[PDB]
Design an enzyme around this catalytic site. Sequence first.
Site, PDB file in Angstrom:
ATOM      1  N   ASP A 190       0.827  -1.198   0.000  1.00 20.61           N
ATOM      2  CA  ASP A 190       0.000   0.000   0.000  1.00 20.61           C
ATOM      3  C   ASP A 190       0.863   1.251   0.000  1.00 20.61           C
ATOM      4  OD1 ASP A 190      -2.740   1.131   0.121  1.00 20.61           O
ATOM      5  OD2 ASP A 190      -1.915   2.044   1.953  1.00 20.61           O
ATOM      6  N   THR A 206      -5.213   4.411  -3.017  1.00 20.35           N
ATOM      7  CA  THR A 206      -4.110   5.344  -2.893  1.00 20.35           C
ATOM      8  C   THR A 206      -3.059   4.991  -3.918  1.00 20.35           C
ATOM      9  OG1 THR A 206      -2.813   4.001  -1.386  1.00 20.35           O
ATOM     10  CG2 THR A 206      -4.650   5.228  -0.473  1.00 20.35           C
ATOM     11  N   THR A 207      -2.776   3.695  -4.005  1.00 26.54           N
ATOM     12  CA  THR A 207      -2.128   3.124  -5.167  1.00 26.54           C
ATOM     13  C   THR A 207      -2.589   3.815  -6.439  1.00 26.54           C
ATOM     14  OG1 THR A 207      -3.880   1.498  -5.408  1.00 26.54           O
ATOM     15  CG2 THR A 207      -2.129   0.998  -3.889  1.00 26.54           C
ATOM     16  N   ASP A 209      -6.791  -2.430   5.882  1.00 26.62           N
ATOM     17  CA  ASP A 209      -7.303  -2.071   4.572  1.00 26.62           C
ATOM     18  C   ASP A 209      -8.555  -2.868   4.251  1.00 26.62           C
ATOM     19  OD1 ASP A 209      -6.574  -0.922   1.651  1.00 26.62           O
ATOM     20  OD2 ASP A 209      -7.340  -2.974   1.526  1.00 26.62           O
TER      21      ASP A 209
END
Lengths: 525, 525, 521
Positions: free
Chosen positions: A57, A90-91, A391
């Site tokens: 992440d 976010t990746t 996550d």
Amino acid sequence: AVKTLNPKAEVARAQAALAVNISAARGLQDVLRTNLGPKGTMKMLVSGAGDIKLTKDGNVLLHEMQIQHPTASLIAKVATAQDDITGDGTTSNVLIIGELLKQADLYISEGLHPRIITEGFEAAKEKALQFLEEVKVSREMDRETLIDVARTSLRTKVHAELADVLTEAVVDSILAIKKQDEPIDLFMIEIMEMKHKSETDTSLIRGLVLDHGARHPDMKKRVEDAYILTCNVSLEYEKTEVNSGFFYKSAEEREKLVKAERKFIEDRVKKIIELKRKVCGDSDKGFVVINQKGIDPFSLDALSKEGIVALRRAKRRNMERLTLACGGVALNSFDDLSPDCLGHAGLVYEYTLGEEKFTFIEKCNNPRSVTLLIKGPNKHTLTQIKDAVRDGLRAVKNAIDDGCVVPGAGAVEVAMAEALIKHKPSVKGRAQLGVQAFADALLIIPKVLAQNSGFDLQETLVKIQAEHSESGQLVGVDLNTGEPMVAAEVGVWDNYCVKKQLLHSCTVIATNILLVDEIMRAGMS
Amino acid sequence: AVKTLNPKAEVARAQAALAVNISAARGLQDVLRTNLGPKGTMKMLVSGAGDIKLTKDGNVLLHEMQIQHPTASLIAKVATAQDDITGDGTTSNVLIIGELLKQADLYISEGLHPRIITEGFEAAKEKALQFLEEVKVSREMDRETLIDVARTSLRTKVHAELADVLTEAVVDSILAIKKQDEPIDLFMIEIMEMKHKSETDTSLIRGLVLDHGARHPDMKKRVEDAYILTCNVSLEYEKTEVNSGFFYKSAEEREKLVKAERKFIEDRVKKIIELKRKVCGDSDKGFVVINQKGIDPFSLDALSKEGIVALRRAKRRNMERLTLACGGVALNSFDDLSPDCLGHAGLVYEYTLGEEKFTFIEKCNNPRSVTLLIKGPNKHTLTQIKDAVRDGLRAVKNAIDDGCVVPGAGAVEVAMAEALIKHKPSVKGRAQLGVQAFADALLIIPKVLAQNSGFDLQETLVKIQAEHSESGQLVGVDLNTGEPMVAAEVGVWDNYCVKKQLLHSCTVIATNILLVDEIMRAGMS
Amino acid sequence: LVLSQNTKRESGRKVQSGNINAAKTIADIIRTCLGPKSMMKMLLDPMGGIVMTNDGNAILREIQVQHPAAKSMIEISRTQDEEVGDGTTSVIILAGEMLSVAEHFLEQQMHPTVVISAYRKALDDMISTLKKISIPVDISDSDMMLNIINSSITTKAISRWSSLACNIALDAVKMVQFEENGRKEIDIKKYARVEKIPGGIIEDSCVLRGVMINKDVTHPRMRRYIKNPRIVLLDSSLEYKKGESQTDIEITREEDFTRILQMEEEYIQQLCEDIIQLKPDVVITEKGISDLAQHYLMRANITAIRRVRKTDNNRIARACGARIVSRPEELREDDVGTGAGLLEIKKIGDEYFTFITDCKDPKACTILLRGASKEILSEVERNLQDAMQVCRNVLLDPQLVPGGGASEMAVAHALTEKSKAMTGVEQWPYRAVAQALEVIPRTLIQNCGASTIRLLTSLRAKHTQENCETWGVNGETGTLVDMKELGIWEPLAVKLQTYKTAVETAVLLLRIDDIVSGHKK
């Protein structure tokens, strides 16, 4: 210019800093793009202190990849926000960002003034979100629905097998979490980790586990039926808040002073034991106590002669889970002591590992707080999976939060693209350019997906760039054959707000990013 | 990797070094794009020694702007050839180069392999050159046609008036050059400069000038009718190569040996003395002597008593010019002396400026060599005007060489662009992208023009991106309204080889540049 | 303090590993550099310039190292590169992997010396194998050479300029055979001068029937253009030279000073009429020129050039076949510049150039390189340098091989036939070399970008068939391709020296067992 004002100062210029910033993200996106997509590769970091990562992440990477370029740090912040908002993508988010700016650059490199393109973006997102709003799939909280979504999310980080094992625990937690209206994910979610016996055996426990054990050998390790004492008031000694200098004159008084001092705590523990004995007149029943503060050894002995399980020095949130576990009435004043104030458990033992001690809560009839005990072979991996876990959960909380859902794997982006490419210059024309690239930037997700999957990009995009018929489908890119796929049919999904916020987040990021000219640095020595 | 081999070594990688060069060249081109175009601005360079430039021909700039990036220096070399080949559009080459790679990166950033795009260029060079080949407008040696291209070349370099002033000079120089078969640009061309009184009054002289004057007072400064001795054998004293120091017993003999030593040179002048007095039995005509070596003071006395102009220490190419102007028979052995060996000019004098002296040769019967006399207000301007003088002359030399002439103002480029875009993937398809990219790079020249000329790029392009009809004409861009204009009618032109060479050279440059992977730095310490 | 006072030592497996590691490093920095799909690398010189070339040797030639065996490998490159030109595009890379598997038996505590023995045993089998599957070919057939020429250059940037270069190479070599060795004439790559001039295009570059001088006429009057020039090569200077024996002169009467002055002048005249006596047209000297002599040569309508490199001079002599002279009085009509189809002095743009072409039977000539920039052209000639190189080697041997890994697999199973027939400890080393051989085509696939394992396995599976020996891999498709139709054909000696050199490295390196530094002498 202002170098006149200050020699040691540093300034950039409109053309200059603009290129610098886009160059900055272009590099930044390049590193991270390897990751998102199940085929992606997590990354290992080494501290200057020597610590170790195995993460994927990006926010973790960005937060820990020591960089100085400011825009990245700015981008890092929103990514962290997104992590505080949803956790993955976010990746994609940054990959969205720089790539947009890259496409953005192409036109200003043609001398186009950026202000126009921003408005194109402004219109572009609006139409997209308009499409985004309508296209989300209203889905119930079907166990499988979320299950696939959990598997959809969790595969992003770990073995297919590992998440699959993980998938069952989280969803059932989610099922065992809601009071049908409002989750907070903090108490009912206990994430505890042990360097023990596997990675896979990490499991939900229907009850609770504690990070410490009893402080006495005679203490019962295991108890069939547990009656619970939740408390925080110290049963360690304490001396009152006022300066209170005493003397005596006799060593006999000295001993008399010995007993008097203890007497207060003596009564305190005495109140409980009578209650216990008022409660546990039966021999079979076992009595357990939990304190957020510490406990006197003499008090420990006091319980010991009564064979009473008690625990001290708990983190302030654990009792909530305890109350969410045993229905116990967490208290401070033991004079107002009632058996109805108690908590009950169907089974408790303690688990000793390594040097530490771990304690086990089992068999709530209707547990409302549970625990993700993390079994670990390796410390980093525990840390590694944990991020994947947290996550995964935050995916679900939004997933339940939103009665709708987005099919994942970028099938949306083509859908975004075609609809957005299907926009005449109902705009003032010049904005259609920025819209075009705005739409153009959106296709990166499958592009890198194919890229991360190794399939050739240009052809696959064209392939999937086939809305079929009146049922021009929400078509995904196969993650292992690089082929058109119904994410919905295959059950590849995503949180709508995720898709919602990221577009919003990136857009606002973009426009301001394009709307700087020089980067000032004139600070005190 | 090779860091294992050497620690102090330096190496790059495929994506890395590739990214470096494009940025290097793209960075390179950005600096120079301010240059070309009559509306462009020349740039002033400052030596670390304090010297000064005012040029716009980037060849000087690149050659003088100290860069350490190798590809840039790599660019410097090939451009150094091009200026040695033609002189302008060197600007175009580099701007052509970088924007070519810029589009190329667009595709390789899309994962498209450079070899494929290189091959895309490979054909792309082919079809255009044929289109370049067919489209050149064959034009014969009309003075005005020479004039305008000369004017076309100069307006890139000097004031519109100043260009016009010089525009007349060179072509009149040029017209007085050709022996209907072979121009050399060297001896017929004298570039001489005086720090005198103007930039505009700088004027071509029908004859030759010399960079020096007499070394004796009695030499007449002005010669009505000039009868010319061209020579190079020293009329200074000299002693044999062999150890030949002599002795004596008498100072009377000492004087005799003084006499003997001078006598050989004394003999030498006498032949000239006689032949002069033999030829110029008339008082009116004047006789002048030229030596590329020095002239002895006593010899100066000899000719002064006979009033014969002599000059010493001339540049070895000057006598060639003395021949090609005055038809003088340049000789060494004065023993085989004929009046037939002479040169005749209608006027010869000296002009004194400040401290230096200049010698004027005028009114040859059929001069084939002249001087581009430069009058100067400022030293740098002399240099600045000088290269453009060099810039124009070769272009006209190129112009006379080729029976065709190319419309300027990029009128060619769109024609290629529409031609190249008028190519279905008759290519192997994946190559067409580079072809598509390649043509895209071609439109840069007009873009920088209007970018230099202020008009908005895309819209100006679109409007000018107009082949009109079956008469889709050769359209230049209006240089002051940014409007479609037919260069042919307005008479803006350029040499075929120019356009011919630059693409060919640039093509060769680019493919190799895109065909490097990492840049290694491991040399001896 | 005992031994040498700050000279380190090392021994044993650590050493041997270090060489292997150093070896393994050496190849990989180049493993991408071979093939029709190869890469092209650009280099940073010590002295500011830029070099770009695919030929690994120059890349390695520009490599500074401290590890000795690495420096050893470097020299290995240039030797074969000197020897054959190309294949250095693979030569070292073959060596290292051979070593790379070679170490794989060291931990088998197997003494390398015996492992050396198999390496010796392996080589002869390879050598014999190749001769069996070599291909003789005619030499007069030009087009085959060009394909061979193209095949040998279908790895370098001149790929797009193959036809010209193939002609360019073919003609140049064809005209170089110094027949004065009977039927054992020898060509030389020191007369085929290569001239890089900026400007122009690849297509402009062409082979000239003779030599070029980057000079200009000493005097204007001499024609820059002559149909049938007559040439004299004057090794000596054309002017007065000091009396070597430190002579000195004492005159007593007046006239002698001038008289001796005329005498050297006369000596000058003395020389000239000897020259004009033979009716030459051209005066050539590696030295300077007396302008006074130049005067009479101008009087003689005879053109003169001065101060030329000797190397070019003899080629000039070799060009018109005439022989150089340093003795004007001893000049021989046998050395007249007869056989010069044209003399001309052109302008490239800021430079006069001397054109002497169309010799009756020129054995020497220079090639004029016309391209983009010297470093571009420097790359070009390197492609030429090898391009001419293999051609002459072909003129040494009419035997050809299908390279491209096809021969390699042919060798491999041939040894595999041997290995299972060669029972003993050395067998495993023997099959090791066979397996080690396989990496070169493997590189191709990596250079191509296809399924190396699947391709190679199919490739190896293909070549288990005895009926087919020419099955190789197309560079671009990355597919199993029989060589006969594909036409990538190779001279025997090329791959010979390849294997020949390859093994010599290993044994040389395999014996290494200790390190000593700091000789300070």
